[PDB]
Structure formats: structure tokens, C-alpha cells
Design a protein around this nucleic acid. Structure first.
Ligand code: CL
Ligand code: CL
Ligand code: ZN
Ligand code: ZN
Ligand code: ZN
Ligand code: ZN
Lengths: 129, 345, 129, 345, 128, 124, 129, 129, 128, 124
RNA sequence: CGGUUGAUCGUUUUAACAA
RNA sequence: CGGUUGAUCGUUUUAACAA
């Protein structure tokens, strides 16, 4: 087969939650520097044509990267218009996709041991419940 | 609202790549100044940013905003636009007819990208807009920094330019200069193209072969200057013409100084990579190994004479009904330069 | 591995009760939706998304060219009228494989999970709790 | 945004006076429902209000919003509009061509005022919009209360209706019925215009005198019903025609029951005040001093016969290629009623 | 039936041109007051159902009446609904049609910011 | 006058009715409207936007003989109308075939008149 | 002279201050009923064609009426687009126009003896200083 | 009265340093502004406004028909090229008169104040302090 | 100078019609794949400065070439810049012009959601 | 064929150039463009939107004699062009006066041809 | 164009500016 | 239509939704 694919679990979220997450991250990154070691990569540093942002969080000797997307297919619900998030953990060309629960646990273990930026509130589906 | 757009939309929309496909919305950041006691004072509340709709471009919304503003008609106003796409035909025509009816306001436009720069309809619309009294420029790095600091809700984050901003800006400046059909005033021509100066201005024309005869191209004629030197800018402008690989093209260059070492190497490599493009350089001064290498690569280096000067004056000079007048010491210096070049090469 | 897959909440949730459906262009008629899905499955130059019916979770099959760094298949010829999907991945540090199928007419089907540094992530999880 | 407009703009713009001059903006409040398991469930996030621009009417913005929504095409949707002005020609045509291409959405429109109801261009545009599958109604007090409670940031303040809301609503309903050219189905005609019923339906036509000859007016033909009785509504509709004071007009009325006491007094006063309008009432039943006073005021009270029934069936009945069929006991009852009326008057 | 008719010359125009005409005419008889002697008659003051509005320009003992029309079954882009303009010089029961040039010359003889001109209203670019 | 001969050369007339509808009903409507009256009939020149309008006399507030006749010859209709234009009493006559609503038409000519002539000469 | 006129001192204010004043009055009138005896007359109860609102405040046996306008001439400053306010005090067909300072003093003498609604903040010119 | 007029801050502010100007249609050319001002002064069916140059205070001359409940004049014939303005009123409980003039060419001029139940308002002012 | 020229029949159309044409053609050769055998040539692939785009419809041993044009000094509303369409049946160095009806009949013979039709593109309502 | 005679009756041709500009320079530009060439010349039919385009041969990628001549008679220009249409080799000839850029024009006719004729008969 | 409004598409066009 | 983008006017169109 001449078609080669990549597999990603993307949590479908609406636009307001994406905006709130980005605003909180940038507010706690520059104004109230509780998270100053984070690297907020801007839009166009990627080979994937649809990757709106990429937040890198150094955890000891590895890093947890949260990438958001825009321009995906529509969802089942009314406000899943093509935006989503995906969180993974990488260490020197070894990557594993991470549950948002575990991602927030890692974030609060290293950094936190305006509301604090959490990924559980970002990725939670408020339209299916 | 004054400056409350997120950085991601800014970075996505104001990318200045000449050919960019999936940006179907137009963003317009506007600011207004007023003349008081001979100085231009900023009007802090009359600024902001707008975006387009399905059938409602940002220019129309700006016109509605101006109508709602009710500016004093016994004053002078300067409006500055920063826009992602150049205005289309309808917007250009309506902006021209707005400028013709309100002579107390002037407009300056900075564009990130040119919209259908290969379409003569939009070229004519842009030329009419420029003739109406509007200043059209290409958005450079300083304007990008100003828009990032002023119109972007960056929260103090530093501006990170994308890759290739300067090259894209130079290419777009060259295309805009071609579209607007700029010309040199006689003082600049006399000061720069004299054979007896910290700037290098070069003119260029293109011809195509058809049955062993050279036919000129009306659109592919112009000139440019330095902002990297001008030769690199010209070589960056070249690839966007999409010259065909089956026909024969000849590019004639009229350059003031001789090309530098790096510029000559780049030109030689470019003309070696593209065998369908012949190069005819007719310089006026010398700024010799690089020149010899360029000549051996396939170029035809020559020295300007009276015929070339007359052609330049008739072609790329805004003489406005004034015949060319040669200066003193032209023929002797030209003959000496030609003899020196013949002895060297 | 096996015990972690059979004991953790996330893997059980994604492995026990899951049915998938394709919602690519929900505002378009059924015929061109089928045509677009077939074209996207055949060219290998565009993404295809499969959304879990209950939650907001989705599987995206990005083309390999969009990765830039580096078994899975989306195939048609096994059975007429159906598309079969296999996607290996690494989830929460363990190697897991997603298996599914959807029919070309209803644009619906089934999908579930199976089982098929590594120590550094285990150490991080132990220190996470 | 869902329901965040101030009460003052609502009260200023949704005033339902038929002739209102200085309201140059159009407000559109939209809501959407979806069909699930046979019931229509409200879509709480797909609702709000928009206003017009210099060259961007609210219908265009609603179409853009619908395009951005990306509704499931395998479902059924009902959209409700509450608008201050009836759509113009461009908006009506584009809404019609949107409805023709999307058969999974239906549209119901409530209008506060009719925009150029005397202009046949807008009348034809509205008729085309109604033919495309849209339901056009007149915004009554219940809809005003609903919009006040739902789309107005009233902060719990009670709704205070303006003076003359009901009369304006009835007049606008009459004009809309004239514009849309409604017709009675055969069952209603048979049930109501039988001489042997808690409703009174009346038809009306107008003629003008020209050289001792009556010429019919194509637009001034129609019928109406009760919501005050129907005669008061008809007398409220009358003044908006602006009948000239130099020519002679005759209004022919086809009413089911005899007018009441107050209705007869109002009609007699109206026809006494306007000497240029003759009245010809041809009733079918009797609901006698008021009738005698109305007849002595100048009216011509008569009883319907077979010719009048045939004219009514041909004129104000949606028979759809079906000839009139008289019912049993028509001639005897009509003759008895005519004899009784002749004996009384 | 066909024994009585009425004949006029009507120039098909666009609706925006009619709006421009009826805007400048109102402006010039209300704000600028240069043409305050002119008269304006609305749609409900005429017996013809197709008459849009009438403008009366006094020329001393006579007048110039310019009338607008909707409801024409001609249409501009074939919409079976088109506007039109008609010109009529009237002098004490005597009436005649006047081409736009002569009407504009009459207006300039007795009268006279854009000005209300008949050539700009009546000329065509759809066929020329 | 230059206006007359400018609008009297190679001028053919053609009917404009329910243009966005099929031709058969268009001639049917032209037929019955010409029979009964009570309607406006338009005849536009092909070259320019000049149009002859036929309005019923009841539409005017007050009040000259002119006719549209189709019963003298089957399949064609004849048009005759006098009208005073620029101070002269020109008469416009023409015909169109009933099958194609097209035909020919031309205007040939027959105290207040001299008053308008004096005013027109004064307006130069 | 056949022209008879009425004289009013109107304090030119911008749109944002008008909106804030109306919102505060209606919030302190219905939700937090500290000012419940006030009568907030809506738009169209007046003979003057341009009188957007009219707030009546009973002071003992008289009343202080504050009326706002829209549709006035433009002002000297940039944001004086045609809206204004005027405060007066009336007792049985006797009216006198009141300084905003004195108006707020009267308001606080009788009623107050989200920010409290004051007319000094409404009528103060923030564009001329 | 006289002492109150000469002692209170408001009356001194409006009587000592005040110059008026007409800004009716500030976005329109001078000629039609003059024409509109003349027309409005002559018909008596529209408002005319005069704004103090320094502050946001303005005098509006509403037509008497807009009042509905009930000496002043705006006259032209006293001097060619000028309009003279007299407006009696009741301010802060005392009877005051406003006198001014503006030229028709510059739409500018001068304007100042003069001096020319009643006891109930005095009692209210005394109790106000 | 005037010894060499080129003659074609060009039908003036509107820009929106050209956009509709080039949208449905792209849709039908990319998404629907009913006309995936057609070829599309852009503006920079032709020597004529006035050629907008070319669409090649294979008909077996021959082809039908439909070309769009900007830059025409005719204009639609007299803007000295108008679009145009030209049709050409081509068979191994043999070329001829084809009216829209015959071209549409050729397309329907070998081929076949709106469909790309030449009558809808070439017909006129500005003069008819 | 019906198409030919449909577009060959009472057809007059007229020049379309810089229409939004005065006439004198319009004929000057028509003159010098017809002299030098290197430009496109349009001739539209009055009735319909059919137009004859005159493109320089250098604009074509490859390669039949046809001319536009004004020096044989002053004040008028003659146009001649053969072109194969629908399988037949029709020749379009005409003239326009140089003063008014208007005139007359008509098309009269003179293995792959039979191949197209067979294909056309098959497409019925 | 304050007209018993015949209706110019008037900040009379705006969610937060005093949270 | 992921094309070395020739550019459909893609929530890739939005200030606060976790203040
Ligand atoms: Cl634009
Ligand atoms: Cl509308
Ligand atoms: Zn535009
Ligand atoms: Zn260099
Ligand atoms: Zn509209
Ligand atoms: Zn009653």
C-alpha cells in the first residue's frame, strides 16, 4: 500500500474554550510569571498545514507538548466545527499520548505544587452532558 | 475595537508569501491622525481593526465607520490602512470615488500581499486607486512590528517574524513597482546614471523570441533600487513570472555600477540553472574576476552609449514632454570605459 | 501493560463501549459525502476523522508527509462496501492498537481497542500519583 | 448575541405605525428549532439579534451566520424571524433563492411594519418570497411580549405597549392580506356563507366613477375576518388608501352577518364624514334599528342571491379549476330573507 | 374596449437613478431653496396606478411636468417590473412631450452641490 | 428637427410583456389585453430605450382619436396614435405581426403652439 | 414674531456614559431595589420628537426629572454626536433647571442618606479635560 | 437672587467667561451650513443649538410645539449679517436671561448671562446643603 | 506589421459567470470525479497575454478546447476591460470554431449537483 | 445551417475601444493600432454579443492569409479573414468608415473535415 | 423632509468604558 | 484544489463564556 498514515487522538473542543486556554496560558506566562519556563510556539512552525499552536512544558528532562488544531472535520455536536487539542509527552524522539487527567497531574506535580491553566477543563465535553 | 485581536489570527493572515491559497478573509487595521497647528496629532479613539464578511469587505465597513464619525470638514485628516489583501475592483473603485468627493482626507495603504497581481482588471483598479490620490506601499518588517505592538493583543509577548519575510517583501515591492508603472524624475536620473553615489538603481526589460525576431513584453518592463543589493531583489522577482521552458527569453539590464562578487556569483548560478533565459547587461560604471566569470557564464556585458541613454530617458524617465539633454564629458568617458572593458575582456 | 490496560479507567472506557461514525461534511448531501470519503481514502493526501458517538473523542488519520519525523492501514478491497481500519499507537506509555470498520453507504460502523523512555515514563507515572 | 439589546432601541424601532419616517435601520431577531423524535426542540445557542449597515442588510448577515453554522443536512429546521421592516427586493430574492436550494429549512417571518406596501416592486418581491415557501405574518402583541421577554435586556422590567398597537396591527394585517392575495378554501366558504357560526368573514371590492361608468380597481379587492369585529378592522384599513376627494368611489361589501350596533354606528358616522365614498352592503344573514339607521345614512343594504354567490366563488374562493355548486335550500331562504328585509325596509 | 387609450413616451431607467432624482429634487426645494418654487406630487395624488411621482417646474405662465413610473412590464434586466420617466410641457390645457435636452435648456433659462439634470436621469448605458 | 429623423430611421418595434415566461402565453396575453383594454401596452424601439405606452383613458383624470386594431387582418395588428411633440402634431403609425410580436413603426406629421415655438427659439 | 421657542440647557455627553447611566438606574431600580419609588418612563411618552428617556425621582412633594435626548446637533468635540441630558425640578406646573451638583445633593439627601447612580459622573466632560 | 447670582459658582462660571459657536452639521461644507442655519432660524420648526467653546454646555432652542404645556427671540433684521438671541429661563430657582449674537458668515459670536414654588425650592436648597 | 494576425470568435460574458464556470469545472474534475479526464491549463502556461485559462475535454482521438479571456478592450458596462469565451475543436493540428450548442452536444455524447454547461456560460441577458 | 443565416442577416459591425473616453482619440488609437499592430482589435455585432477578435500572430505559440487594410481608400478600412467554422471554410469580410468606426460585415463561404462532419452527424 | 410622518437607509448602529 | 499553494472569499470570522 502506497498510503502511509499517522494516528492522533484529538479531543474536539469549541472555540471559546480554545480562546480561554490560550489567554490564560499567555497571561500566566508573561504577566504573572508562575509559568515562565514554558515555550509558547506561535502558529507556523510545523510541517502539518493545520496546527494552530504548540505549547511546550519542560518536565525535568522531557517535555509535555500540547498542540491545538484548526481546520479539522466537523463533529457530531453543534459546536464541534473543526478545532481540537492533543496532549503528548516526549523524550528524545520517543513520544506517548497522554490522558488529560495524567497531563494535569504532571503539570501540578512540577509547577504548581486568573485561574490556573488546566487541561481537564479545556478537554472536558460540556456539550455531551 | 482598538487592538484586541489574538496573535494567531495575525500570524496566519498577515503572512506575506506572494502566493497564499487558504486565506479567504481580509483583515483591515485602520488609524486616523488630524492636523493641528501644523503638526499631525494621533486620534487615539479613531483606530481599530475589522474583518470581512460573505459579501461585505472591510473597506465598506470602514466607509460606514467614517460616515458615522462625522469628522469636521474644515480640517485635514490622514488615514493609514494595514490590510492583508490588496483591494478588489469594487472596493478600489468605491474608495476612489470616496476620495474624489472628500478632499480633506488622505489615505495611505500598506498591503501584506497583492491580490491577483497577474490580473489586469485588478491592476487597472489599483492604478485608478493610486491616481485618485492614495499612496500604496508594501508592508515591511517595521510595519509588521508596529501592527504587532499596536493592534495585536500580544500581552507583551515579543514578535517572532516568519521565515522569508524580507525576500517576500522585496519581491512584492518589485511587483507593485511594475504594476504602478513608476518612473524616475530627471534629477535622480542625472545624479545616478552619470559616468563622471551610495545607491544602485537598475532598469530591466524582457523580450521573447518568435520566428527569429525579438518581441517586447509590455508588462515586463521596469526598474528597481536597493533597500541586500538590487540584483538579488531582481533575481527574487524573476521566478514569479513563470517563464516558459520551451521559448527563448532575453532579459536586458541597465545597471549603474558593476555587480558585486556575491551578486555576480548568484547571477551566474541563476543563468546557468536556467538555459532558456539569456542575459544582456549594459552597465554605466564599474564598482574584475566576478565580471569575467559572469561574462563567461553566458552574459553579454557592455557599456552604455548615447543610444542607451536616449532609450532610458524615453522609457524609464518621467520627462513629461521634455527631450533628453546630454551632460558634459559623456562621449569621452563612455569611449574610455568601452576601451578599458574591451582591453580587460 | 496487560494489567494496566485491563485495570485503568481510560483504556476500559475506550475499549468496552465504543462505536464510531464518520462526520466529514455534515452540511452536505449524502452522495457527495460518500464521494469525498472514497476520494480521501484513495488518494492518501487528506485527513480522515472518526468520532466516537458518545464522547468528543476522535481518531484522525493524518498523512505521513505532515509528520516530518517518521503497519497501520485504511483498506477497501477486503470487502466491497466496507472500509477496514488498523492503527497502532502508544497511549499512556503502553503500545495499543485500534481496530475498526465502517460501511461506505451509512458512513457508520464499529471500532474498538486491543493490546499488542518506556521505563522513564513508568517512573514519572509512579512519581505522579 | 442572545438577547442583549437595550429597551429604548426596541421601543424606537419596533413601533408598528404603518407610516414611520425616521427609522433607517433594520433589526432582525432570529431563533432556530430542530426536529427530534417528532417534536420541535429549541436550539438555545442558535438565536440572537442583528442590525443593518450602510450596504449590508440583516438578511445577508443571517445568511452568513447560517453558512458558518454548518447545520446537519439530514435534519429538519424551523427558523423564526422578528423584523422591523419587510425585506426589500434584493433581500427577498436572495432569501427565496436560499430557500429553493435548502429544502431542509423552513422560515417564518413576523414583521412590525410593511416597507413600501404601495410599491408593486416590493409587493412582487414579497409574493415571490411567500411562494418560495416562507410564511409571512404581522407581529401582534403576543410576539411583541415574546421579543421583550427573550431578546431585550429588560432586567425584569414589565413591557409597556405603545398607544394604538392593536389598531396598527389590524391595519397591517389587512394590507398584508391584500398584498398576498389570500383566498378562502371551499369548506370555509360553504360553512360561513350559508343562509340555512361564531365568526364573521367579509369580502370587499372598490370601483371608481369615470364618465358615468364604474371601473374596478385591481389592487383594492380582498376579504378579512375577526381577530373588535371585522367591520372596525375594515374601517381602519380604509384611511391608508388615501382616496381622492374629487372623484367618486363605491365600496361593495359582502358580509355574512348583519353589522352590530356599535359597528353600524361607526360605519354610518364614517360614511357621513366622507361624502365621496358610497357604500353598497349585500349581506347574507341578519345578526333592526341600527340597520335602518345605516340604510338611511346612505348605504344600500341588500341580500345575496345566486349571482352574488357565483361572483364570490369566482372571485374570493380558491376553487382551483372547480365550478361553483349551490347547496340545498338556497333560493327559498334567499327569497324569504329578501322579502323580510323589504317588509322591514 | 379599445376605442380609448393614452399615448406617452417613457424612458426606461434604473431604480437607483429614480432615487437619486427624487433625492436631489427634494434637497434643492427644501434645504438649498434654489428651487423652492417647484411642486412635488406623491403617488396617491394621481389616478394612474403606474404614476410614481410628479415634479412641477413653473416657467412663468406655463409649467414643465416630469413624471416617474413604476409597474412597467418592460423591465431593465427582464424582470417585468421597470421604471420610466416622461416629460410634458403644459400651458393652460395645452400639452406636449419634450425631449430631455430642451427640458434642461428650459430649466437653465429660468433657473440656476449637484444639480437636478434631466440628461443624467434619462440617458442610458445599458444599450449605449 | 434632428431629433425626429434621428428617431425615424430603420426603426423597428417589438413588444415587451411577460418576458421571463414562454412565448405562447405571451401572445395570448397580448391578444386578450389588446381586446379588452384595461391595461398598459409597451412598444420599445430596438436601438434605444424609447417606448410607446398605451394607457386606458380611465387612468387619466380628464378627457384625439387613436386606435389599435387587429380584426381587419388576421395575424397582424395595426397601431395609430397622434401626439403633439415639440409643438408639432406628429402622428405615429405602425404594425406588428401577431405571431412574433415584432414589426415596423414610424412617425409622420400631419395659439399655444406658436407660444411654445417662440419660447423654444428663445431657449436657443 | 410668529416663531415661539423653548430654552433648555443640555449637557452634551457621549454614548457610553448614557448606556452606563441607564444600566445602573435600571439595575438599582429592579434587582437591588434601593431606588424603587422611581418611575423610569420609556422612549415614546412625549410631544418632543427627540427625547429618548425620562427618569422621575419623587422628592417629598415635588419631583426631579432627568431627561436624555438623542438626535441633537453635533458638538465641538469628537464624541459629541447628538446625545445629551437635562435635569430639572418641578412642583405642580412650576419647573426650574438644576445644576448636576445640586441634583446629586438632592438625590443623596432623600434616598441614599454596582456603583450608585449619580448625575455628576454622567454630566462631567471627560473630553475637555 | 442678586446675591445668589453674584455669589454662586455656577452662575459666575456661565456669566464671566463664555463664548458661543454654532456646530450644526460639522461634516458639511460652510455654504450649506450657512443655508441650513438661515432656514432653521426662519421657519421656526427645527431646533438650533449653541455650544459654549470651553465646556460641554449647550443652549437648545426647541420649537414651542414640542413642549405641549405652554419674550425670547431669535431675530435677524436688527443688523444684516448677525443673529441676535434672547432667552429668559429659570435656573437654580432664580430667573435669569441669556443674551447673545452670532454672525451668519463665521457661525460664531458671543453669549453671556444677565439678571432680570419659589419659596419651596429655597427651603429645599436650605435643607440640601 | 499588419501582414500577420489571428482571428477568433469571442463571446463577452460577466466575471461572475467565468468564476462559476471555473468553480464547477474544478469541482467536477476534483471532487465528483465525473470529468477527471479533463485538463486545466492556467494563465502562465500560454503565450497569449489575454488568455485566462484553458479547459481541455478529451473526445477520444480529438479534443475540445474552451478558453477564457480577460483584457478585452470591449467591456460589459463599457469599462474597457471585459471577459470572453472561445470554443475550438482540435484534432491533430486541425482546428475549428464550434458554437456552444454543438459543443454541449459533444460533451453530452461522451460524458454525463450542477453540471458545467456551455450554453449557461455563453448566453446573454444584457442584449437579450 | 441555421446558425449562419441567424448570424448573417442585417448585421452591422461597430468598433469597441476606449469607450469611456472622447471620440477623437478613439479614432486616433484605432488608426495607430491598425497601422502598427501589436494589439487586439474587437468588432462586435450590434444585435448579439458575438465579436471578431484580431490578435497578432506573435501571441500564438505556432504559425492562412487575412488582412486589415486602410490605405486603399482614405477614411475607410476593409477587413478580410478566413476561418474554419463547424467544418466549413467560411470567410468573413467587411468594412467600417474611419470617421465613425461603424460599418457592414458578412460571412460568405469559399480528411479531418469529413471526420468532424461524421462526428457532428453522430451527435445529432 | 418634525411633515395628521408616504419614509433620505441619522451613534435615532452597537453588551460591559462608573463591575 | 495540502497543490514547490496562481489562491473557492473555510469558526483558518470574532475581546471577556474558567475574571
Ligand atoms: Cl477587499
Ligand atoms: Cl431588508
Ligand atoms: Zn474588496
Ligand atoms: Zn551585492
Ligand atoms: Zn433588504
Ligand atoms: Zn361589532
Amino acid at each position: 500500500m502506497e498510503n502511509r498514515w499517522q494516528v492522533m487522538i484529538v479531543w474536539q473542543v469549541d472555540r471559546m474554550r480554545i480562546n480561554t486556554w490560550k489567554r490564560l496560558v499567555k497571561h500566566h506566562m508573561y504577566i504573572s510569571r508562575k509559568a515562565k519556563d514554558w515555550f509558547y510556539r506561535h502558529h507556523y512552525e510545523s510541517t502539518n498545514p493545520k496546527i494552530s499552536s504548540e505549547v511546550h512544558i519542560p518536565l525535568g528532562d522531557a517535555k509535555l507538548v500540547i498542540t491545538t488544531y484548526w481546520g479539522l472535520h466537523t463533529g457530531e455536536r453543534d459546536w464541534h466545527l473543526g478545532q481540537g487539542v492533543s496532549i503528548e509527552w516526549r523524550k528524545k524522539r520517543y513520544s506517548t499520548q497522554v490522558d488529560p487527567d495524567l497531563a494535569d497531574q504532571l503539570i501540578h506535580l512540577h509547577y504548581f505544587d486568573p485561574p490556573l491553566p488546566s487541561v481537564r477543563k479545556l478537554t472536558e465535553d460540556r456539550w455531551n452532558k | 475595537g482598538p487592538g484586541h485581536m489574538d496573535p494567531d489570527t495575525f500570524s496566519y493572515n498577515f503572512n506575506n508569501r506572494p502566493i497564499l491559497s487558504r486565506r479567504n478573509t481580509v483583515w483591515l487595521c485602520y488609524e486616523v491622525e488630524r492636523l493641528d497647528n501644523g503638526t499631525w496629532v494621533k486620534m487615539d479613539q479613531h483606530r481599530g481593526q475589522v474583518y470581512s464578511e460573505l459579501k461585505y469587505h472591510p473597506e465598506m465597513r470602514f466607509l460606514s465607520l467614517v460616515s458615522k464619525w462625522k469628522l469636521h470638514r474644515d480640517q485635514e485628516y490622514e488615514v493609514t490602512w494595514y490590510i492583508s489583501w490588496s483591494p478588489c475592483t469594487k472596493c478600489a473603485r468605491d474608495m476612489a470615488t470616496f476620495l474624489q468627493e472628500n478632499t480633506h482626507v488622505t489615505l495611505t495603504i500598506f498591503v501584506a500581499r497583492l491580490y491577483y497581481f497577474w490580473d489586469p482588471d485588478y491592476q487597472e483598479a489599483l492604478r485608478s486607486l493610486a491616481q485618485a490620490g492614495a499612496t500604496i506601499k508594501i508592508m515591511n518588517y517595521d510595519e509588521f512590528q508596529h501592527c504587532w505592538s499596536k493592534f495585536v493583543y500580544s500581552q507583551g509577548a515579543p514578535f517572532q517574524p516568519w521565515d522569508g519575510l524580507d525576500e517576500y517583501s522585496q519581491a512584492l515591492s518589485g511587483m507593485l513597482g511594475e504594476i504602478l508603472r513608476h518612473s524616475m524624475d530627471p534629477p535622480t536620473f542625472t545624479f545616478n546614471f552619470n559616468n563622471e553615489r551610495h545607491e544602485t538603481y537598475l532598469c530591466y526589460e524582457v523580450e521573447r523570441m518568435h520566428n527569429d525576431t525579438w518581441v517586447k513584453l509590455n508588462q515586463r518592463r521596469g526598474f528597481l533600487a536597493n533597500q541586500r543589493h538590487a540584483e538579488l531583489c531582481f533575481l527574487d522577482v524573476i521566478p514569479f513570472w513563470k517563464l516558459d521552458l520551451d521559448q527563448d527569453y532575453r532579459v536586458t539590464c541597465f545597471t549603474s555600477w558593476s555587480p558585486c562578487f556575491s551578486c555576480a556569483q548568484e547571477m551566474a548560478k541563476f543563468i546557468s540553472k536556467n538555459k532558456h533565459v539569456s542575459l544582456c547587461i549594459k552597465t554605466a560604471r564599474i564598482y574584475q574576476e566576478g565580471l569575467r566569470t559572469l561574462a563567461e557564464a553566458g552574459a553579454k556585458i557592455s557599456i552604455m552609449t548615447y543610444s542607451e541613454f536616449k532609450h532610458c530617458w524615453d522609457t524609464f524617465v518621467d520627462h513629461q514632454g521634455a527631450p533628453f539633454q546630454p551632460w558634459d564629458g559623456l562621449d569621452e568617458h563612455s569611449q574610455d570605459l568601452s576601451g578599458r572593458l574591451r582591453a580587460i575582456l | 501493560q496487560r494489567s494496566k490496560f485491563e485495570n485503568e479507567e481510560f483504556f476500559r472506557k475506550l475499549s468496552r463501549e465504543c462505536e464510531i461514525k464518520y462526520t466529514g461534511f455534515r452540511d452536505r448531501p449524502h452522495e457527495e459525502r460518500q464521494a469525498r470519503f472514497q476520494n480521501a481514502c484513495r488518494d492518501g493526501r487528506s485527513e480522515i476523522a472518526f468520532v466516537a458517538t458518545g464522547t468528543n473523542l476522535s481518531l484522525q488519520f493524518f498523512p505521513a508527509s505532515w509528520q516530518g519525523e517518521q503497519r497501520e492501514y485504511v483498506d477497501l478491497e477486503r470487502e466491497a462496501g466496507k472500509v477496514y481500519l488498523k492503527a497502532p499507537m502508544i497511549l499512556n506509555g503502553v503500545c495499543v492498537i485500534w481496530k475498526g470498520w465502517i460501511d461506505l453507504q451509512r458512513l457508520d460502523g464499529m471500532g474498538c481497542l486491543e493490546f499488542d523512555a518506556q521505563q522513564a515514563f513508568e517512573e514519572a507515572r509512579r512519581r505522579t500519583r
